[PDB]
Write a protein that binds this ligand. Structure first.
Ligand SMILES: [Ca+2]
Ligand SMILES: [Ca+2]
Ligand SMILES: [Ca+2]
Ligand SMILES: [Ca+2]
Ligand SMILES: [Ca+2]
Ligand SMILES: [Ca+2]
Ligand SMILES: [Ca+2]
Ligand SMILES: [Ca+2]
Ligand SMILES: [Ca+2]
Ligand SMILES: [Ca+2]
Ligand SMILES: [Ca+2]
Ligand SMILES: [Ca+2]
Ligand SMILES: [Ca+2]
Ligand SMILES: [Ca+2]
Ligand SMILES: [Ca+2]
Ligand SMILES: [Ca+2]
Ligand SMILES: [Ca+2]
Ligand SMILES: [Ca+2]
Ligand SMILES: [Ca+2]
Ligand SMILES: [Ca+2]
Ligand SMILES: [Ca+2]
Ligand SMILES: [Ca+2]
Ligand SMILES: [Ca+2]
Ligand SMILES: [Ca+2]
Lengths: 222, 222, 222, 222, 222, 222, 222, 222
C-alpha cells in the first residue's frame, strides 16, 4: 500500500515502528542523532521540523495513508495536526494525548483518532489494586505472541447475515469467536443488544484463536 | 480499606488519583512544588525521596495495601521497588515500565503487576492505520462513565456453577454478560475453551450493563 | 475599565507593561524567578501554566477586556489561544507570531490581532540598505515622547462630516492632521480615494501635533 | 550594486533574505546545519564566528554595501559591530537590538541604524487593546502585496520644487501621494510645518498608489 | 578456567585488572575512549551499555566465571545485576556499593558479594586518629609485595583434621600460620571458639609466611 | 581531647563522621548546600576553600589533634596537605588517595596515614572470584557491631611481659586474643616471629571478644 | 583624591585592591557571595550588573577618577565600557583583554589603557626557555617591596632641563637613575636618542633607589 | 635544539606557542577537540592527563629542554610539577601561578621559574590610574614589533671587560644600550651599583636598537 509518515521519535512510535515492519515508513524528527536508530528499525529518516508546513510537505504527507503524530508536548501535537490538515484534508491522523484535557482540542484540530497512554495507564493502575486481570487482559490481547487474537472481520456485500439479529445469529455458539463489539463508521457498540440487526459494511470486533477466525470468515461469507 | 502509597508524581498518577476517590492516598515525591496539586486531588503529601528507605517508612509503606511506583527512569523504579521489598515483603506493588525490555527486570525486582503504557500505545497506534475500533474498545471499557463495564465477579464457595463447565453454563444467553476470561491466582485464561470447568475461587472477567452484572451475581449465588 | 491578562513573560510583554501605566494587569507565567520584575512594573503576578485551562480560569480571563498572548513558541501561543477561546468566546485576544506561516493559524485559532515582530523587523532591515527613513518613521511615531502622535479619532453619531467625501471635507488644511486611513470595523482603508464618503461610526487614523488633534476633534463634532 | 553580508541567522534575517531576492548575499553564522537553508533562500553561506575579524574578512565585508548584524545577544552584536568598524569604517551597518536600553550603545559602537523589533511589538500590543488600526497600518504598508506603498523619492537638482514651501507646493492635491515625512541626511521631519522650504537633496517619504507615484516622480522633475 | 566480565570502568576495576593479569578479561563500558586503556591493561574491550541485556550478551556473560559490576550509581548497578540474573542465574556477581544503605538491596538484586569501599575507608579514617595500625594491617596483607599473605586452604576429604577441635588441633604452634577465620558455604566464623570441630569442606583463612603455608598444606592432607 | 578538622565532604567523610560520635568535629567544605547534612551528624560547619591557607586558619588547624583530608581529586588533596603543613608542622594528617601512583606523593607532602579505598576495593574484588572470605573478614572486623573486635592494647611501662618473647608469653591460650601484629612507632610487624621479644611501649594489634580483651589487659598489667 | 570604581571581581582586581590601600573603592559585581572578600579588602560592595547603566550609576561612575573593567568575557567588557561611556565620557577606563585580538576593539570602545595579561605571560614564558632574567625584571620592578622603584617623575614648568637635550643632561651619571623612557601625553618613547630635547610637561620613566629618585626630583627643579 | 613540552592549553600557552615557532613543541592536554588548533599552531598534540606520570612520560619529558606548565588550577599545576620532578630532576619547569599565595609552593615543588599574570596585571592596573606609562613600557618592550628590543647578552670568557667596574665601563655612553640589570646564576641585580665588578659568565640585560646590540656585542668581545 501507500507509505506512512511518523512525526516525532519516542517510545510509542518505536513500538509502532516495531509492529509496522514491511511497510514504507518515513520518520520526521529534529534530532540528527536518531538517524541510526530509525535506520536500524528499518525506516527512512527525514531531517526536519514536524510543525513546519515546508518540512511536513517534504516528508510527502499528501500521498500517505496515515500520519502518526507523537511530539514532545500537546501544543506541538496540535500545531503539527493543524499543519497536516492545512496540507491534506483527507489523510488519516493518529495522535497521542499527554493530558486528558486536550483530547477534545486534538479531535477538533483534525485528528482522526486520539490515544491517551497516561489515561489508560492511570485507569489500569487504579484498577489493579485488588487484582490485575484487566491489565493482564489488555496487555495480552494486544500482543502478537499469545493464542487469542483480537481482529476486525468486515461484513461483505450480499452475505448470509444481512439483516439478521444477534440472537438468531449465534456467532459464539457456531464459530467460537467472542463478539465483544460491532462497529459502524466512526462509532463502536460494545456488547451489542439482542435486537441489533446486522447491516452490510459492518465491522465485527472479536477475540478468538485463528481457526475460529477462519470458521467465522467462512460463516459470514457471501 | 487501608491506605495507598504513591511513589513519584506524573500524569499516570494524576489519572490514578482521579479514579481513587474514596480512599486514603499518601504521595511521596521529591519536588516540593507538587504539594498544591497533590492536596487539591484529595491526597496527603509526604516530601522525600522514594528510593530512600527512611522516606519510604515516612509514607507508611508497612500498613498500606498497595504501592504504586511511577518514577522518572526504570533504574529508579527498580531501586524503589527493592526499597519497598526491604520494608514490607508481602505488600502489593504496581509498577510502570518506561521501556519494553525492563519488564522482566521489574518483575524480578518484586513488582506484582507491571503496566507498560508505551507498548500499549504503540500497539494501539499501529492497529489503527486501517480502522480504530480496537483503540476505541480499550479506551471505552476502562472509563467509568460509559454503559458497559469490565468487572471481576468472583465465584463464591458453595456456588451453583462449581464443577459446571462453561459450555454447560452458557452465561451470555442467560445473564447477558460476555465472559471474555476466567482467572485464578496469577494466571488468566482469555477466551476459555468449552471443556473448562469452574471452581470455587475463580474470578470471572466480563463486560455488561450493571443490570446484567447484578443478574450474573445472582446467577452464581447459592 | 476592566483588567488585562498577559500570558507569558518576554521583552514584548515587558514593553507592553511599560506603556500600560494606570491599568490593572495580571501576568500569568510559569517561571517563579520573574515575580519581582512583574511586581516592579505595577502588575499582579499569577503563577501557572498558560496553556492549561485551569490556570487560565485562575487569572480571570472572563472579566478581562483584552488578553495578550506571547509565549516561547508559536505552538504554545496557538494552544493558549485555543484555551482562552474555550472559556470566553467574545474576549479580545492579541497574539504574537514568531513565524510568517503561523499568522493565519493564529487567526483561525481565534486571535483578533496578530502582531509579527520578526516580519516587521526583516522588512525594515531590507528597506534600510540605501537610506532608512521608513524605520525612523515607524520607530518615531510609536514612541509616546515625540512631537507628532498617531491617534484614532472616532466619528460621533450626528457629526457634521456625515456624507461628506474626503475631498470635500479637506481635513489637512483645516486641522493639520495627516489622514493616512479610515477604519470601519475590522477593515482599514489606507490612503482613501477622494470619492470615499464618511459615515458616523468611522475611525480616522491620523498623525498630528496635539493642538491639531484637538482642532480636529472640535472640527468633526456635532 | 555590491553584495550584502548578514551576520547571524534568525527569523529577522530569514524574512530579510526573503525580501532581498535577486541580489548577492553572504550569510556568516556559526552553525554548519543552516547551510541548506541559506542556499534554499538563495544566498551563499560562510561558516565562521561573526565576532571574529578573520571570519568577517572571509565573508567579504570590505566590498559590501551593507552589513546586517543580528546575533544572539547585544554583547555579541556590539562585538561584531566593532569588528566591522575595525575592517571598514565606511560601510553601512544595520543592527538589531534585543533589549531597549542597548540602543544608544549600539549606536555608539558604530551602527548606522538600530531596529528594535520587540519595542515596536510591545507598543503595537499596547495600542491594540482598544482597536488595532496602528498594527494594521504598519503591517499593511510594509507588506509588498497591498495597493499603497511607502516609498521614497529624491528631489533632483534644479527642480521646480526647490525653495518652495509645502503650503505653496500642495503635493497631495495635485499628485495624490500623502506626504508623511521629508528628511535630510540622517534626520527625518515627520509632518513638516507649512514654513518648511524644500531644498535639493531631500528625500520625500510618501504613501500612495503607483500611478500617483509616477505622477509624483513626473511632477518633481528638474 | 573461563573468562571474567567487568561492567564499567573506574579505579576499582583498574586495580582489579592489575591484579587479574594472565586471565581473559572482557570490559563492557559506554565510553569508546577507554579502549586503549583496556587493551594496555591486557583486556578485551566491548563497547555498549552495561544495563542492557543485548550488550551484556555481546560481552559473553553466559560462559563467565565471575562478573564484576562497578557502575556510576547504585541504581545502574542494581539494573545491571538484574540484567545478568536474567541472562545467567548461576554466575557469580561481585558488586560495589557507592552508599552504605544500598548494600542489602544490592544483595536482594542478586549480588553474590558486595564490596563497599567508602565504608571501609571511613572506618579506617576514623580508627586512624590515635594510631593507624589497622589501615597498615589491611593495606599490608592485601598488597602482594610483603612477606605475610592472607590465603585460604580447603580441608580435603578424609583429612587428619576432620572432626577435631581447634584447641586439640593447635595449628599455630605446629604450622606457624595464624588462624583468623574458618568458614563454610557463604558464612565465616572469625576467631572460632575452642569447641568448634572441623569438618570436610571448610575453608581456613590464615596469615603466614609461604614456608608456613606449605607446612599447613602438608599438615592438613588426607 | 581536642577537636578534629575534616576537609571536604564525601562518602568517606560521612562514614568517618558517623563513627566519631562524642567528639568535636569541624567540617571545612566549599559547598553551602551541605550545611544541613553536616549539622545533622553533630559537626559544626565552616564554609571555605580547603586548599586556601586562610580558610585553613579559620577552622583552627593548630589546636586540632587530627586533620582528615578527603577532597574531590588527588591534586586538591596534595595542595591541602601542603597548606596544612605550612601552618602546623606537627599535626596528624590522614589523607585519602584516589590513585595508586599518588600514595608516595601524598606521603612526601606530609600525610601521616594515607588510606587508598580504590586499591583495597580492587584487591578485594580480584580476591572474590573464587570465594570471598577475605572481603567478609575485612568488612566484618571493622564494623563496630559484630562479636569480634580489632583493638590496640599498649604495653605500659613496667609490664610483666617486658623481655618475654611471643613464644614464651603464649597470649592466645591465656587470653584468647589473636595476635596478628606488634607495632612500635610507625612500624607494624604482622605475624611476628617467635624470637621477637616484647618491650614496654609496644602496641599489640589483636582480635578477640571483649571479655578476652579485658583478660588480656589484666594479663599484661604491671 | 576621588574614588575608584571596579567593575567585576577576579584575581586581577584582588591584587589591584591590595595595592589600592588609602583610596576609596566601590566594587560592582553580580555575585552576592563576594561581599565578604570585598569588605575584608577595604572596599565598598555594590550589588548589580556592570553592563547595566542603572547599576553603573549606583556605583558612582560620574564622580570617579578611574574605572577598572575586568569582566568574564571581552564581549561583556566592551558592553560595560560603552555603558560607562554613556554616563561619563571623560572618565579614565582601564580595561583588561582576555584575548589578543580584542585589544583594538577595546580601544575603539573607549578604554584609555588596555592591559592584556595573557600576552605578557606568554611572552615571558617563551623568553624563559634559556634563562629568565626578563621575567624576573618585570616581576621585580612592579612589586613595591624591593630596592629599585619604577617611577614617573614629571618635568615641571620653569625647569633647569627645559630645552636641554638628553645627551647634554646625562642624568644617570649625575643622579643615578636609569632614564628608560620619556613620555608626553599618550605617546611613550622608550630609549630616546641623544638628539631628543626635553620640554615642560614631559614625564620621565626611570628606575632607581628612592634616594636617587629624590636626587632626580631635586635635579630637575628650578 | 631539543624539544619543548607544554602541559595544558590556554591563552598564555597559545601566545607562548606563537612566539616558539620553528622549535619542536609537544602539547599534552585532556581535551580531544583542541587537536585542530594545536596542529594549526604548528605543534604536535599528545592526548593525555598531564598530572599522570605515565602520560607525562609519553610526551617525552626526559629529553625536553623546558616544560611549560599551565593547567586549570594551582593544585593541578603543583601536582604536574611534582610528577615532572619525579620523572626528571634536571629539566627546566616554567609554571604559571593563578594565586599569589601559591608562588612559594610552586617554587618548593620544583619549578625553575614561576610567572604570575594576575599579580602583574593587578599591579599594572593599580599603577595605570594616574597615567599608564609602565604598562606601555612593559607591553611594548615585550613585543617583537617595536624598534627597541630587550635582550640578554652574555659575557664571554677572556673578554675586555673582565674585572672592570660599571663606572669605568660606560656601556650606555659607548654602545647606546641601556643596561637595566646584570644577572648571575638564578639571581638578578636591577640597577647595579657603581662598584659592581664584572665577572666572566655574567648576563647583561639591556634595551636598545639592534645596531646598538651589535656594537655592544663587538665591544664586550674576547
Ligand atoms: Ca508521547
Ligand atoms: Ca481488579
Ligand atoms: Ca473461542
Ligand atoms: Ca512515567
Ligand atoms: Ca485495525
Ligand atoms: Ca450484554
Ligand atoms: Ca515573543
Ligand atoms: Ca529606504
Ligand atoms: Ca501638521
Ligand atoms: Ca535576534
Ligand atoms: Ca488603538
Ligand atoms: Ca492617494
Ligand atoms: Ca565506583
Ligand atoms: Ca587506632
Ligand atoms: Ca607465623
Ligand atoms: Ca574521596
Ligand atoms: Ca578468595
Ligand atoms: Ca577467642
Ligand atoms: Ca579576567
Ligand atoms: Ca631569555
Ligand atoms: Ca642607580
Ligand atoms: Ca593560566
Ligand atoms: Ca603611572
Ligand atoms: Ca640606546
Amino acid at each position: 500500500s501507500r507509505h506512512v509518515v511518523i512525526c516525532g521519535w519516542s517510545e510509542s512510535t518505536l513500538e509502532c515502528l516495531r509492529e509496522l515492519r514491511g511497510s514504507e515508513v518515513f520518520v520526521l524528527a529534529e534530532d540528527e542523532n536518531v538517524r541510526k536508530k530509525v535506520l536500524r528499525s528499518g525506516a527512512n529518516f527525514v531531517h526536519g521540523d514536524p510543525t513546519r508546513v515546508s518540512d511536513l510537505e517534504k516528508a510527502n504527507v499528501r500521498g500517505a495513508r496515515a500520519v502518526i503524530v507523537d511530539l514532545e508536548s500537546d501544543s506541538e501535537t496540535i500545531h503539527c495536526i493543524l499543519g497536516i490538515r492545512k496540507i491534506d484534508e483527507s489523510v488519516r491522523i493518529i495522535a497521542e494525548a499527554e493530558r486528558y484535557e486536550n483530547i477534545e482540542q486534538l479531535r477538533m484540530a483534525g485528528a482522526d483518532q486520539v490515544i491517551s497512554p497516561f489515561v489508560i495507564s492511570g485507569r489500569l493502575m487504579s484498577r489493579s489494586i485488588d487484582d490485575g486481570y484487566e491489565a493482564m487482559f489488555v496487555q495480552d490481547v494486544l500482543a502478537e505472541e499469545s493464542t487469542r487474537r483480537m481482529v476486525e472481520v468486515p461484513i461483505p456485500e450480499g452475505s448470509k447475515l444481512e439483516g439478521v439479529s444477534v440472537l438468531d445469529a449465534d456467532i459464539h455458539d457456531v464459530t467460537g469467536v467472542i463478539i465483544i463489539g460491532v462497529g459502524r463508521g466512526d462509532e463502536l457498540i460494545i456488547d451489542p443488544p439482542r435486537d441489533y440487526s446486522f447491516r452490510a459494511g459492518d465491522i465485527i470486533l472479536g477475540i478468538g484463536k485463528p481457526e475460529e477466525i477462519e470458521r467465522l470468515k467462512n460463516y459470514i461469507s457471501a
